[PDB]
Design an enzyme around this catalytic site. Structure first.
Site, PDB file in Angstrom:
ATOM      1  N   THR A  26      80.009  31.099  65.893  1.00  0.00           N
ATOM      2  CA  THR A  26      78.749  30.423  65.488  1.00  0.00           C
ATOM      3  C   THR A  26      78.452  29.142  66.216  1.00  0.00           C
ATOM      4  O   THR A  26      79.336  28.323  66.465  1.00  0.00           O
ATOM      5  CB  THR A  26      78.765  30.054  64.001  1.00  0.00           C
ATOM      6  OG1 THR A  26      78.684  31.252  63.238  1.00  0.00           O
ATOM      7  CG2 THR A  26      77.586  29.159  63.649  1.00  0.00           C
ATOM      8  N   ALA A  29      78.931  32.874  55.332  1.00  0.00           N
ATOM      9  CA  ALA A  29      77.573  33.394  55.222  1.00  0.00           C
ATOM     10  C   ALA A  29      77.079  33.374  53.779  1.00  0.00           C
ATOM     11  O   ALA A  29      76.022  32.817  53.477  1.00  0.00           O
ATOM     12  CB  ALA A  29      77.528  34.814  55.762  1.00  0.00           C
TER      13      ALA A  29
HETATM   14  C1  LIG Z   1      79.752  31.256  62.253  1.00  0.00           C
HETATM   15  O1  LIG Z   1      79.916  30.283  61.531  1.00  0.00           O
HETATM   16  C2  LIG Z   1      80.258  32.609  61.814  1.00  0.00           C
HETATM   17  C3  LIG Z   1      79.104  33.579  61.298  1.00  0.00           C
HETATM   18  O2  LIG Z   1      79.694  34.892  61.173  1.00  0.00           O
HETATM   19  C4  LIG Z   1      78.460  33.267  59.877  1.00  0.00           C
HETATM   20  C5  LIG Z   1      77.447  34.358  59.497  1.00  0.00           C
HETATM   21  C6  LIG Z   1      76.178  34.157  59.078  1.00  0.00           C
HETATM   22  C7  LIG Z   1      75.583  32.776  58.891  1.00  0.00           C
HETATM   23  C8  LIG Z   1      76.714  31.733  58.621  1.00  0.00           C
HETATM   24  C9  LIG Z   1      77.757  31.825  59.753  1.00  0.00           C
HETATM   25  N1  LIG Z   1      81.174  32.422  60.688  1.00  0.00           N
HETATM   26  C10 LIG Z   1      82.383  32.953  60.777  1.00  0.00           C
HETATM   27  O3  LIG Z   1      83.259  32.877  59.903  1.00  0.00           O
HETATM   28  C11 LIG Z   1      82.547  33.664  62.096  1.00  0.00           C
HETATM   29  C12 LIG Z   1      83.955  33.522  62.773  1.00  0.00           C
HETATM   30  C13 LIG Z   1      84.591  32.105  62.752  1.00  0.00           C
HETATM   31  F1  LIG Z   1      85.797  32.149  63.390  1.00  0.00           F
HETATM   32  C14 LIG Z   1      81.288  33.157  62.878  1.00  0.00           C
HETATM   33  C15 LIG Z   1      80.751  34.318  63.803  1.00  0.00           C
HETATM   34  O4  LIG Z   1      81.613  32.103  63.818  1.00  0.00           O
END
Ligand SMILES: *C(=O)[C@]1([C@@H](O)[C@@H]2C=CCCC2)NC(=O)[C@H](CCF)[C@]1(C)O
EC number: 3.4.25.1
Lengths: 250, 242, 212, 244, 233, 241, 204, 198
Positions: free
Chosen positions: C1, C49
């Protein structure tokens, strides 16, 4: 179910009187006379054992109760109310003092506890005041001997000598004539017997009178030996025989 | 004495009936429902010339599609409004949609009979019924524009037009003859302004009376004094016209 | 993210990626990481999320309630503290959220509050949250100017996310843009990172180390 | 149900008065008079013991003057048992304050709290009010010597001189008549005794029917000292002031 | 007399009566009329909706409690809502926990018990509403009459509310007839509307004034109002 | 435990306990408030049933809820304390959660809600108090004056009075206060307030206390002299005719 | 980790001819970091003295608690509390927290105002009373203190002599304890008067 | 941890607090003011657990402002520090303790003297000429032990602090992004906007 009487049963009347307290006092007035006299080396409390029937065993009913080993009580008014008050007084002496300081409460403080319990029945929801007046006599190291009166309102006062119940007015008058600050315990006992005789209608002996004193320590009533600092209770109920012996010198 | 939830020999709840009496003493409030929206008007009825008339709030927003007018012990309506706003917002949080006007009304009416000193049915901790009646007006996709009358009895009726408060019996009789299924929003506005003028002790002006409406397009709006002043002027002219 | 928000002359720029991963599994390349609290308030989502989605939507409900009660637009300070205080009540329970509450009020002007599940609430000019944050910070820190044009600011934000989408395995999919003005936020589209990368590489001349 | 026996101790009269408070005050008006007089160098508390006997133990007695703090004391007019309940909680509030701030509780803070307790019995709970009126004499480093009064209603006010209990109307007029801002503790002591002496419903004013106390700042020290006169001490000051 | 023994439901009068309960019953009589009757294949509810003004609606008098059960009310509407809601929960509980549709007779027992509690305890008040419950369960069609006193009775047909005695005598007469109207809903309803019209006086049942509900063999409890009842006026 | 309904409806639709709560207000000392063009003044009268009080320590009639808002009242003193404390607590809570001090209308709406609540909650009687709440909204210069009563009803006034003989002083204000030209000065506003009180205080230099509230937490109470001066200049306005 | 080894500090009380002495160091540290050299661990309520070692926050809390309790005691009893009685009060107050105790090692010292008898007592964190006739030790250097006392001590020492003894016991024990020192104060107590002396010692 | 320093000179108390707010791998802010004014003459600085830190500070701030309004008086610095110590002493035995350490610097208008109080999250309170929380004391106390004088002027105090911060910037592994300095005296609380190079 559920006590839904959460409002006071004692309240102020337009005149400023608290009816239930007055009436409670009236009940005390109808009660059998009881009294107390403070001597220089002791205190005596006595009352009449108004046996409600010759078939009843008067001994199985003590109007003079030990609260702590150096404090005793007597009363006038409703015996049942007194009986529960004694159970509560014996308990508070422990829960609110002995369990905290490891020693029995001084007479004035236990009296203060009792008084509080009585005051609450004057204001708490759904109850009536206690219909009794107590006379508590005790002794404690820093206050010496003392005598207190506790009324239905919860008010209490220290006395040199006094009486409550039926013939209190007369008895008080008779005590004022014979009391002085030099009476020895035996003198007070004698005066007690004389005052009580005027209030008794029928038989007047060690089986119809109940009497106790707060005097010297009775190491013989302790139950054990081995601890110098524990010398025995100062409270002692006189025996029927001990009373009669003194009635002959009446 | 006598329980607050006691029945009269005629099968009515004393506190509720006595409640209705306080509501009769309240300021007049009127509502008119049309296929172009619903109009809600009230009598400010200030008690002194020093009282700033615009601090009188007898018409309030529940949500964008729901508004309401009150009559009676108005202080009693605050917790009702609060409950209503919470109910509408909560519904939207749970369902991602607007709450239906009838459901919102039914929810407010559920508080109504929740009074007593220990009624065996739940935990109705309220010493007396509400001393205020409400006119809930709004719009929703299923039943279009709607006007409801919510009473301290917990019952709510739907009306095409309704008046509550001191001049209600009179005003209601008027609404009986004036209302028809084809009124325009503008007609309803003047019509409410006219009835308020008849039952009000004071001479209606844009300061002691207030109008509002709710339309599917712009939702609930409270007309500002200037907008109402003009409508008042327009009413006087059509009246003097015959 | 990768999520970011920054304050400037024209208001606020909000940019996020759209990838969701559980371990090495790419659960989605089209997730929303911006919650439209209401027409004037935006919230970014990083971490959990469910936690962000649920509480940021709930926040919207609290904001609305405030406005009905006070007949006045809620401040960003107040909106952000509602979330902050809520989250703080749960401290230790395991909520996982890194968020930015963004608004533009007459009283405060462009405002951004960083709020996380630790109970931290920080007001600031620039914030990046997520496993890709460090990447976006490099791009933002060296090109940020308060006097940026709404057009350039929008590009900077989009470029910063692109930087992170490229280097961070947990970032990617597409870029979602927002411009926050005192009259509300303006959506500025969804830009697939796949297409965006090649376009930017050519037109910009960057990402030279990648064969195109 | 129970409603039938509920006196409703907390309601308004058609005149907007609280029945029970009014009746409690009536009760207090029959209580031994208590007087409070504040001087430039101290405060004087004097009270008349209602009902006494030859056999009453005065040395061990106390029914009107109570120490709440080392810097605050009260004179009681009303039901003694009710008074002790309030005095005990007041003594506790003082210590809570001390433990929290490490400073003795300002006199008014303590008086307001006790008055708030009283006010409660006036608005909820369905219980009778306390049939008590207090005169508070205390000292703190913000207002120095202070004299306050609280009654069943929970209302309190500050005074230079004041009385509670029986014949306060008479007692007040006498005090208002001879009080002077620049008075001295000894002057106040004398004024108090004279006032009680004229309002007493008894024959003479003897020591066995009085309780006396003073809160002074003993010059030879720098701190505040409360003095609750002993029987013999009252007897003395009684002869000196010319009452024998 | 009465005045001294009707201040609450926890007080018996010298003759063994419970006035508060009786006064509650009076709220039912004041309520608009509603009729209920059944054959061996269906159960029908016909209720006259009363209106406040001619600008007001005709208050709903029928509530569905489950796919196989529902009722009609006469009296305090709010109390009907509370009671039907309770019935809905009980029907629901039976389904979720035992995968079993609640027996109409069981529902009647539950209502009786819930109402009884509000007649022996201080602070509460009896329910001020009457209810007619119809349903189709594992033993066929059923019709129940519920009274605030807590008395619930199973009948072939009945009526409650103002002038209800009209419809009641009619049904007590038509008995042998309608009880055999099996396999034909329209007939059962028509018979229901004929029993109800026997309690009219003021006006005549119109389109936005008539309310009908039916349940049976292959018919889930459904409510007809307005245009849908036109073919019965 | 105690939950008896003390505030209920009577046959004519009145809640006598709330009604009688007002009677308690009519009995209290008079209070008045008038808003100028850039300030709000609050005047109260001082009883005289007993005089020998210590003005230094005796609780004053005007109380600060926060640094920009004050509250005065007529009615039971003991009752007012409860509302004052709750208002003060609420004022700090609002600052802590909204990061902004309360508006005068907000604080008023709060006090009023507490009062309303005590009119339909078991086991409690209504407050025998009516209040005047004045001040300036944060970062605002427009004066604010609101009034609340036992029922929980509230509203804003250009000027208002409560308490005994408030009928009299209200009339004075109704025919001496022009919304067109409000007392454009702290001085002429304080004057109008003292004038209105003199209609009922009957010569009471030490029986009249004023408090002036200006924008940005500028609040101050006048001293006997400052007020006595206003009285003096006013008695001349009369004699000079 | 160990609550009784975070702040450091010691206290020692001794009996002598018609007198008692109680002493303590003045250190208050944060593990190896010295923080205050003015943290006295001796308090008094009337003529009764209380020394408390252990976790500083509890030492402060307990002092405030006992000041609070002895103040109410005096208001009701109308006399100052005695050593024997106070010891019971300390004991029951500590046991009241049996399963979430104050991490302290209290020591009581005083002369009974009525019998003139010298009195000292020690307690464990849950109230167990140790009523010794000779001496009582407490703190992070209690082992060292036992060694010092068991040798240096002897019965019926006069006030001036007990002063030298109590001081040498305290001082030399503290110098073998990393968490004790940074100053020391000694209290000499008699029926009529009480003298407090601050000692000179290493500051490392 | 963050930098929290305090020095009580002749007529004032100075509090220096680091400006950095770091979360994991990134420094999120470099202008953080780790302080709350409790009353016109009382300032409190703080460091500790992420959320507890401010929540606690503001909670104390709210309580003291409430006391000020109710009593129309300003509690002495000693009284305020006792209130704070008790709050922390309750907290340490609660379900989830506040992990916050504080320095209370106040000017006692009655005694006309500055006062510095150091209190940790266990409720351990001590009054000092100078103090710190965390590792800060380890690098700076030897300097303060040496140069400190009770009659120092505010100006001398600032110079001594500057010396401490320089030692902190040389030997400490973390970049705390400088400090914000505030002075508390008879005239209130003011911030030294110029310490980035004083
Ligand atoms: C980013 O924070 C991550 C996302 O999957 C979520 C999904 C939807 C909106 C909020 C953020 N969160 C995670 O846990 C994941 C992996 C972290 F190592 C992500 C892709 O980075």
């Amino acid at each position: 179910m559920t006590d839904r009487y959460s409002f006071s049963l004692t309240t102020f009347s337009p005149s400023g009187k608290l009816g239930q307290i007055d009436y409670a006092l009236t009940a005390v007035k109808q009660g059998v006379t009881s009294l107390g006299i403070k001597a220089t080396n002791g205190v005596v409390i006595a009352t009449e054992k108004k046996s409600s029937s010759p078939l009843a065993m008067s001994e199985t009913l003590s109007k003079v109760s030990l609260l702590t080993p150096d404090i005793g009580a007597v009363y006038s008014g409703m015996g049942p109310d007194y009986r529960v008050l004694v159970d509560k007084s014996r308990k508070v002496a422990h829960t609110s003092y002995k369990r905290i300081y490891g020693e029995y409460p001084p007479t004035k403080l236990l009296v203060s506890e009792v008084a509080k319990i009585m005051q609450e029945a004057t204001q708490s929801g759904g109850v009536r005041p206690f219909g009794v007046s107590l006379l508590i006599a005790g002794h404690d190291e820093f206050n010496g001997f003392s005598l207190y009166q506790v009324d239905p309102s919860g008010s209490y006062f220290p006395w040199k000598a006094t009486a409550i119940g039926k013939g209190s007015v007369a008895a008080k008058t008779f005590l004022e004539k014979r009391w002085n600050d030099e009476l020895e315990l035996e003198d007070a006992i004698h005066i007690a017997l004389l005052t009580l005789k005027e209030s008794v209608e029928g038989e007047f002996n060690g089986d119809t009178i109940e009497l106790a004193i707060i005097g010297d320590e009775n190491p013989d009533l302790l139950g054990y030996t081995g601890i110098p600092t524990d010398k025995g209770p100062r409270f002692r109920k006189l025996t029927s025989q001990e009373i009669n012996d003194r009635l002959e010198a009446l | 004495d006598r329980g607050v939830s006691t029945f009269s020999p005629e099968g009515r709840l004393f506190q509720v009936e006595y409640s209705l009496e306080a509501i009769k003493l309240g300021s007049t409030a009127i509502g008119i429902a049309t296929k172009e929206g619903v109009v809600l008007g009230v009598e400010k009825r200030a008690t002194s010339p020093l009282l700033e008339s615009d601090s009188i709030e007898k018409i309030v927003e529940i949500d964008r599609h729901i508004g309401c007018a009150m009559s009676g012990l108005t202080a009693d309506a605050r917790s009702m409004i609060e409950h209503a706003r919470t109910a509408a917002v909560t519904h939207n949080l749970y369902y991602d949609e607007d709450i239906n006007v009838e459901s919102l009304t039914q929810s407010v009416c559920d508080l109504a009979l929740r009074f007593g000193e220990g009624a065996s049915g739940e935990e109705r901790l309220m010493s007396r019924p509400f001393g205020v009646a409400l006119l809930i007006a709004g719009h929703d996709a299923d039943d279009g524009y709607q006007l409801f009358h919510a009473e301290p009895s917990g019952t709510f009726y739907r009306y095409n037009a309704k008046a509550i408060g001191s001049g209600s019996e009179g005003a209601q009789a008027e609404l009986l003859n004036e209302w028809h299924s084809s009124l325009t929003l503008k007609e309803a506005e003047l019509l409410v302004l006219k009835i308020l003028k008849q039952v009000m002790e004071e001479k209606l002006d844009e300061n002691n009376a207030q109008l509002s409406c709710i339309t599917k397009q712009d939702g609930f709006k409270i007309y500002d004094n200037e907008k109402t002043a003009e409508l008042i002027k327009e009413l006087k002219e059509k009246e003097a016209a015959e | 993210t990768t999520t970011l928000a920054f304050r400037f002359q024209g208001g606020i720029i909000v940019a996020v990626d759209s990838r969701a991963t559980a371990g090495n599994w790419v659960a989605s390349q089209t997730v929303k990481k911006v919650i439209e609290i209401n027409p004037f308030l935006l919230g970014t989502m990083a971490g959990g999320a469910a936690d962000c989605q649920f509480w940021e939507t709930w926040l919207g409900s609290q904001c609305r309630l405030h406005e009905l009660r006070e007949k006045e637009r809620i401040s960003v300070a107040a909106a952000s503290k509602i979330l902050s205080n809520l989250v703080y009540q749960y401290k230790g329970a395991g909520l996982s959220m890194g968020t930015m509450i963004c608004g533009y009020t007459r009283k405060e002007g462009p405002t951004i509050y960083y709020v996380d599940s630790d109970g931290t609430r920080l007001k600031g000019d620039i914030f990046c949250v997520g496993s890709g944050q460090t990447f976006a910070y490099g791009v933002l820190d060296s090109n940020y100017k308060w006097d940026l044009s709404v057009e350039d600011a929008l590009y900077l934000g989009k470029r910063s996310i692109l930087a992170a989408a490229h280097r961070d395995a947990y970032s990617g999919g597409s870029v979602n843009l927002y411009h926050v003005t005192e009259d509300g936020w303006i959506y500025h589209g969804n830009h697939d990172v796949g297409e965006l990368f090649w376009k930017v590489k050519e037109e910009e001349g960057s990402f030279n180390n990648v064969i195109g | 149900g129970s409603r039938r026996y509920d006196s409703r101790t907390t309601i308004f009269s058609p005149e907007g008065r609280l029945y029970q408070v009014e009746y409690a005050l009536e009760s207090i008006s029959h209580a031994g008079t208590a007087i409070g007089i504040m001087a430039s160098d101290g405060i004087v508390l004097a009270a008349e013991r209602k009902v006494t006997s030859t056999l009453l133990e005065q040395d061990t007695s106390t029914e009107k003057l109570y120490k709440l703090n080392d810097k605050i004391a009260v004179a009681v007019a009303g039901l003694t048992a009710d008074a002790e309940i309030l005095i005990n909680t007041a003594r506790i509030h003082a210590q809570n304050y001390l433990k929290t701030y490490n400073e003795d509780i300002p006199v008014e803070i303590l008086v307001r709290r006790l008055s708030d307790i009283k006010q409660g019995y006036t608005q909820h709970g369905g219980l009778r009010p306390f049939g008590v009126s207090f005169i508070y004499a205390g000292y703190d480093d913000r207002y120095g010597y202070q004299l306050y009064t609280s009654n069943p209603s929970g209302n309190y006010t500050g005074w230079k001189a004041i009385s509670v209990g029986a014949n306060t109307s008479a007692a007040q007029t006498l005090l208002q008549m001879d009080y002077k801002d620049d008075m001295k503790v000894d002057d106040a002591i004398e004024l108090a005794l004279k006032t009680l002496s004229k309002t007493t419903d008894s024959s003479a004013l003897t020591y066995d029917r009085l309780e006396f106390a003073t809160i002074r700042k003993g010059a030879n020290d720098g701190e505040v000292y409360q003095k609750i006169f002993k029987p013999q001490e009252i007897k003395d000051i009684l002869v000196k002031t010319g009452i024998t | 007399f009465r005045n001294n023994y009707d201040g609450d439901t926890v007080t018996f009068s010298p003759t063994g009566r419970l006035f508060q309960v009786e006064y509650a019953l009076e709220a039912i009589k004041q309520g608009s009329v509603t009729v209920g009757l059944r054959s061996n294949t269906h159960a029908v509810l016909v209720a006259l909706k009363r209106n406040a003004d001619e600008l007001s609606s005709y208050q709903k008098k029928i509530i569905k409690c489950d796919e196989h059960m529902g009722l009609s009310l006469a009296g305090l509407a709010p109390d009907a809502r509370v009671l039907s809601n309770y019935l809905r929960q009980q029907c629901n509980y039976s389904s979720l926990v035992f995968n079993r549709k609640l027996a109409v007779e069981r529902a009647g027992h539950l209502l009786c018990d819930k109402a009884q509690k509000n007649t022996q305890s201080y602070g509460g008040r009896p329910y001020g509403v009457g209810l007619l419950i119809i349903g189709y369960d594992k033993s066929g069609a059923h019709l129940l009459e519920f009274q605030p006193s807590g008395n619930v009775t199973e009948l072939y047909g009945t009526a409650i509310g103002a002038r209800s005695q009209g419809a009641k005598t009619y049904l007590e007469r038509t008995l042998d007839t309608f009880i055999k109207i099996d396999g034909n809903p329209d007939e059962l309803i028509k018979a229901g509307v004929e029993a109800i019209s026997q309690s009219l006086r003021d006006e005549s049942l119109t389109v936005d004034n008539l309310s009908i509900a039916i349940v049976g063999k292959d018919t889930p409890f459904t409510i007809y109002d307005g245009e849908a009842v036109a073919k019965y006026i | 435990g105690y939950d008896r309904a003390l505030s209920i409806f009577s046959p004519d639709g009145h809640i006598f306990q709330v009604e009688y709560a007002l009677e308690a207000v009519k009995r209290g000392t008079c209070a008045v408030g008038v808003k100028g063009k850039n300030c709000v003044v609050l005047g109260c009268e001082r009883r005289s049933t007993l005089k020998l009080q210590d003005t230094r320590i005796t609780p004053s009639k005007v109380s600060k809820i926060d640094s920009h808002v004050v509250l005065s009242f007529s009615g039971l003193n003991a009752d007012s304390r409860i509302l004052i404390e709750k208002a003060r607590v609420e004022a700090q809570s609002h600052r802590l959660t909204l990061e902004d001090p309360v508006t005068v209308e907000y604080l008023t709406r709060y006090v009023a809600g507490v009062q309303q609540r005590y009119t339909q909650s078991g086991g409690v009687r209504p407050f025998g108090v009516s209040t005047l709440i004045a001040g300036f909204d944060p970062r605002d210069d427009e004066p604010k004056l609101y009034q609340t009563e036992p029922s929980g009803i509230y509203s804003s006034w250009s000027a208002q009075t409560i308490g005994r003989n408030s009928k009299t002083v209200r009339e004075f204000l109704e025919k001496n206060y022009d919304r067109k030209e409000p007392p454009a000065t702290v001085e002429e506003c304080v004057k109008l307030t003292v004038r209105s009180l003199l209609e009922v205080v009957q010569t009471g230099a030490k029986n009249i206390e004023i408090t002036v509230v200006k924008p940005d937490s500028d609040i101050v109470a006048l001293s006997s002299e400052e007020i006595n001066q206003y009285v003096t200049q006013i008695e001349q306005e009369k004699q000079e005719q | 980790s160990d609550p009784s080894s975070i702040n450091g500090g010691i206290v020692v009380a001794m009996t002598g001819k018609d007198c008692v002495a109680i002493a303590c160091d003045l250190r208050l540290g944060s593990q190896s970091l010295g923080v205050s050299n003015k943290f006295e661990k001796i308090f008094h309520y009337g003529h009764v003295f209380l020394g408390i070692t252990g976790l500083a926050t509890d030492v402060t809390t307990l002092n405030e608690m006992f000041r609070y309790k002895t103040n109410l005691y005096k208001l009701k009893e109308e006399r100052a509390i005695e050593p024997e009685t106070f010891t019971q009060l300390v004991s029951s107050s500590l046991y009241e927290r049996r399963f979430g105790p104050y991490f302290v090692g209290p020591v009581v010292a005083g002369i009974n105002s009525k019998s003139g008898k010298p009195f000292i007592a020690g307690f464990d964190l849950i109230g167990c009373i140790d009523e010794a006739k000779d001496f009582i030790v407490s703190g992070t250097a209690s082992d060292q203190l036992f060694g010092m006392c068991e040798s240096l001590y002897e019965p019926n020492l006069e006030p001036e002599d007990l002063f030298e003894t109590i001081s040498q016991a305290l001082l030399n024990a503290a110098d073998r304890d990393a968490l004790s020192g940074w100053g020391a104060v000694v209290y000499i107590i008699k029926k009529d008067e009480v003298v407090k002396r601050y000692l000179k010692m290493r500051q490392d | 941890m963050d930098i929290i320093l305090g020095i009580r000179v002749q007529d004032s108390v100075i509090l220096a607090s680091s400006k950095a707010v770091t979360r994991g791998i990134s420094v999120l802010k470099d202008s953080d003011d780790k302080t709350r004014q409790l009353s016109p003459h009382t300032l409190m600085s703080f460091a500790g657990e992420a959320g507890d830190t401010v929540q606690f500070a503001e909670y104390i701030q709210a309580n003291i402002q409430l006391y000020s309004i109710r009593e129309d008086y300003e509690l002495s610095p000693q009284a305020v520090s006792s209130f704070v110590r008790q709050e922390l002493a309750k907290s340490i035995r609660s379900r989830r303790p506040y992990q916050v350490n504080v320095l209370i610097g106040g000017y006692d208008k009655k005694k006309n003297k500055p006062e510095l109080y150091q209190i940790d999250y266990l409720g351990t309170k001590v009054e000092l000429p100078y103090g710190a929380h965390g590792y800060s004391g380890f690098y700076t106390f030897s300097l303060l032990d040496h140069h400190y004088r009770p009659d120092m002027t505010t100006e001398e105090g600032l110079d001594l602090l500057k010396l401490c911060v320089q030692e902190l910037e040389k030997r400490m592994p973390m970049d705390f992004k400088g400090v914000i300095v505030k002075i508390v005296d008879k005239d209130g609380i003011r911030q030294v906007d110029d310490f980035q190079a004083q």
